[PDB]
Design an enzyme around this catalytic site. Structure first.
Site, short mmCIF file in Angstrom:
data_model
loop_
_atom_site.label_atom_id
_atom_site.label_comp_id
_atom_site.label_asym_id
_atom_site.label_seq_id
_atom_site.Cartn_x
_atom_site.Cartn_y
_atom_site.Cartn_z
CB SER A 94 -8.82 -3.89 17.04
OG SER A 94 -7.42 -3.63 17.22
CB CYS A 188 -2.40 1.66 24.21
SG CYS A 188 -3.37 2.35 22.88
CG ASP A 215 -4.30 -4.40 10.36
OD1 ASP A 215 -3.66 -3.62 11.10
OD2 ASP A 215 -5.44 -4.84 10.67
CG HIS A 244 -6.55 -1.77 12.27
ND1 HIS A 244 -6.37 -3.08 12.67
CD2 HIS A 244 -7.05 -1.12 13.34
CE1 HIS A 244 -6.73 -3.20 13.94
NE2 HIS A 244 -7.15 -2.03 14.37
#
Length: 265
Positions: A94, A188, A215, A244
């Site tokens: 990620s 984020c 995902d 994911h």
């Protein structure tokens, strides 16, 4: 040196083939625990926590500095330079796939191979680019994270895991709940502002992109985009399950891919 303690750096296994495992948002290095035994007889493995992990003292999180991913790259490079490692393979999940791409461009000498899991160069949609998210959508996410972080995390964890694997949901939830909510929001925001599309051709390392069958954060078309635009020799390797976080939900299957991808470099 100071980072080695602060970011909980651990070196396990042995070998001339060095592998770095770098986790994603909402986890820490413990997310690698089930695939780790498949690697350490064969490899020297370096694990560390991102500065935003709940397992790191949150008073180290400099909001000004970690405004962009270059600062996370700096940490990674400083860890490897402190350990006197001149060459390694890097496995990034990620946000750590983004960190690995950037680091491989900054220091091509250091990165012999990349393995990218749950990976994307850009999560927001753009013209003729399907990232998977819209602005209004992430605005609501950001508001939910502030209004009621715990309820947000409770709802997100099973969507990220994807498959109905309750132990993986429990484990991912554990580490999400451990993140300080203001740090979570900041990370984020930083990730959703990141766009690596333009620099993908600067990567010189060979790359394995791991694709699962669904995902929530990475549309199926992203792996082909990465294969078309990454500057090194790139392949897409397919797992026959969804999610994911395959290192949590299907670690034995993921381990097969990691053993093959880390065999020679």
């Amino acid at each position: 040196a100071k980072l080695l303690q602060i970011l909980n750096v651990r070196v396990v296994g042995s070998g001339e083939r060095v592998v770095v495992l770098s986790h994603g948002f909402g986890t820490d290095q413990s997310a690698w625990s089930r695939v780790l035994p498949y690697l350490t007889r064969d490899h020297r493995v370096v694990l560390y926590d991102l500065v935003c992990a709940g397992s790191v003292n949150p008073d180290h999180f400099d909001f000004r500095r970690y405004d962009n991913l270059d600062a996370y790259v700096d940490d990674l490079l400083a860890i490897l330079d402190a350990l006197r490692i001149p060459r390694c393979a890097f496995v990034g999940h990620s946000v750590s796939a983004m960190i690995g791409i950037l680091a491989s461009i900054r220091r091509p000498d250091l990165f012999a191979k990349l393995v990218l899991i749950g990976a994307s160069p850009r999560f927001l949609n753009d013209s003729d680019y399907h990232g998977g998210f819209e602005l209004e959508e992430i605005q609501q996410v950001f508001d939910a994270m502030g209004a009621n972080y715990s309820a947000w995390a409770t709802g997100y964890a099973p969507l990220a895991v994807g498959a109905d694997v309750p132990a993986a949901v429990q484990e991912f939830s554990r580490t999400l709940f451990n993140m300080r909510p203001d740090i979570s929001l900041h990370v984020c925001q930083t990730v959703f502002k990141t766009d690596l599309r333009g620099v993908l051709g600067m990567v010189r390392a060979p790359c394995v992109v791991v694709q699962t069958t669904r995902d929530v954060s990475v549309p199926a078309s992203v792996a082909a985009y990465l294969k078309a635009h990454l500057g090194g020799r790139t392949t897409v390797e397919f797992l026959q399950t969804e999610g994911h976080l395959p290192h949590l939900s299907a670690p034995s299957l993921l381990a097969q891919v990691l053993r093959r991808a880390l065999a020679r470099y």
